[PDB]
Amino acid sequence: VLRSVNSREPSQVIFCNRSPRVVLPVWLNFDGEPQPYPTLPPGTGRRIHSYRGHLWLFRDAGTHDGLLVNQTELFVPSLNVDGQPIFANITLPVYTLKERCLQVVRSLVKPENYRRLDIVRSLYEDLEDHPNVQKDLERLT
Amino acid sequence: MYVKLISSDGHEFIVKREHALTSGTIKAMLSNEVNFREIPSHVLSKVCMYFTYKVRYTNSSTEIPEFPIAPEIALELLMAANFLDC
Amino acid sequence: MDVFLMIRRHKTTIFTDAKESSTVFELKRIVEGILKRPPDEQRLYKDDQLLDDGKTLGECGFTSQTARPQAPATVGLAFRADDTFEALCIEPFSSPPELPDVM
Numbered sequence: 001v002l003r004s005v006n007s008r009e010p011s012q013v014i015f016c017n018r019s020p021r022v023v024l025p026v027w028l029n030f031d032g033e034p035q036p037y038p039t040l041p042p043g044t045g046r047r048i049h050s051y052r053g054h055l056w057l058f059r060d061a062g063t064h065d066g067l068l069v070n071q072t073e074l075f076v077p078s079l080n081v082d083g084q085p086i087f088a089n090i091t092l093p094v095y096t097l098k099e100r101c102l103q104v105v106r107s108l109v110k111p112e113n114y115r116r117l118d119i120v121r122s123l124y125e126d127l128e129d130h131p132n133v134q135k136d137l138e139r140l141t
Numbered sequence: 142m143y144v145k146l147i148s149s150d151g152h153e154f155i156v157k158r159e160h161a162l163t164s165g166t167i168k169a170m171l172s173n174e175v176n177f178r179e180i181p182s183h184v185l186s187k188v189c190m191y192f193t194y195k196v197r198y199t200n201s202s203t204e205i206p207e208f209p210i211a212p213e214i215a216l217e218l219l220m221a222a223n224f225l226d227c
Numbered sequence: 228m229d230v231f232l233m234i235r236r237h238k239t240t241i242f243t244d245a246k247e248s249s250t251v252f253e254l255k256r257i258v259e260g261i262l263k264r265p266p267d268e269q270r271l272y273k274d275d276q277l278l279d280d281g282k283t284l285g286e287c288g289f290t291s292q293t294a295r296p297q298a299p300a301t302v303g304l305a306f307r308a309d310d311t312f313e314a315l316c317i318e319p320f321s322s323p324p325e326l327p328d329v330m
């Protein structure tokens with residue numbers, strides 16, 4: 001379902017990373033497979049060539065935490081009006097306090113040690129169940 | 142309209158009612174003071190800052206900064222967020 | 228511009244926002260609504276400095292870029308019991324435990 005359409009109509013885009021994270025742009029190909037693209041360091045922009053009807057999403061490159069693009073999950077290049085590139089503004093979402101805590105804990109504890117933390121079993125499963133594009137594709141579908 | 146949230150060590154945090162309703166757990170405990178026997182002040186102060194942060198940056202246009210969490214409080218804060226469902 | 232504040236006395240902490248251009252006295256009116264003590268029975272402090280009623284929060288160093296939602300600036304509060312002002316006293320928050328080995 002979630003796939004790019006093969007339009008062949010060019011569309012220039014600025015990927016603008018207004019987050020403090022290293023960003024991984026991910027293009028959903030014509031079969032719906034995620035294809036990773038070169039990363040963007042914090043605060044940087046790239047002018048890129050994509051196409052109308054192509055689908056992109058954006059993640060933290062290190063952790064795969066979800067990012068927003070123009071305030072939504074998915075970005076589709078649109079028609080360039082008067083030769084201007086489309087801006088894709090990549091931002092942090094307001095994470096829930098729980099997800100933000102899980103992020104910090106995962107950044108400090110090696111996965112083989114999650115079981116050594118003194119927490120309810122359900123929080124072990126929440127640490128192990130880390131963010132992943134495939135699962136978000138299943139959810140968005 | 143403010144509510145009072147009280148830590149396990151007796152610190153009393155006064156926050157706007159609508160900010161506190163960020164937590165469905167807190168909503169149930171009200172529906173206007175709440176005592177938390179398992180949440181200490183160094184954790185509950187951070188939860189209150191989260192409420193302010195969430196309400197300020199939800200449905201906003203201006204760039205969103207990272208919500209900061211010291212490594213020392215992350216575990217307790219994780220347990221509190223799980224209980225409070227925020 | 229909004230500044231985000233923690234107004235603190237003993238074991239009491241109020242989370243509130245105000246304008247950079249609002250005054251110290253106006254902040255006392257906010258405390259009065261919450262703790263039911265009039266402005267003349269209140270002293271507000273930045274660290275150990277007593278704040279003057281007519282000054283703006285911005286003039287007193289509470290700016291929108293330092294007094295942020297996720298890291299609010301602290302204003303100390305002292306009450307006048309009857310005749311004399313109590314000394315500024317802010318109970319610290321509890322101490323976090325030692326980092327476990329795995330962290």
Ligand SMILES: CC(=O)N[C@H](C(=O)N[C@H](C(=O)N1C[C@H](O)C[C@H]1C(=O)NCc1ccc(-c2scnc2C)cc1)C(C)(C)C)C(C)(C)C
Pocket residue numbers: 006007008009015025027037038039040046048049050051054
């Ligand atoms: C093959 C097909 O059916 N259609 C072609 C097409 O869609 N080609 C794709 C294509 O050129 N794409 C897919 C996405 O729309 C983006 C574009 C692409 O790969 N552009 C080059 C590019 C290089 C680096 C970047 C990035 S991302 C972060 N940094 C950089 C430098 C972005 C884009 C590939 C299949 C070659 C990957 C077309 C005939 C339209 C040229």
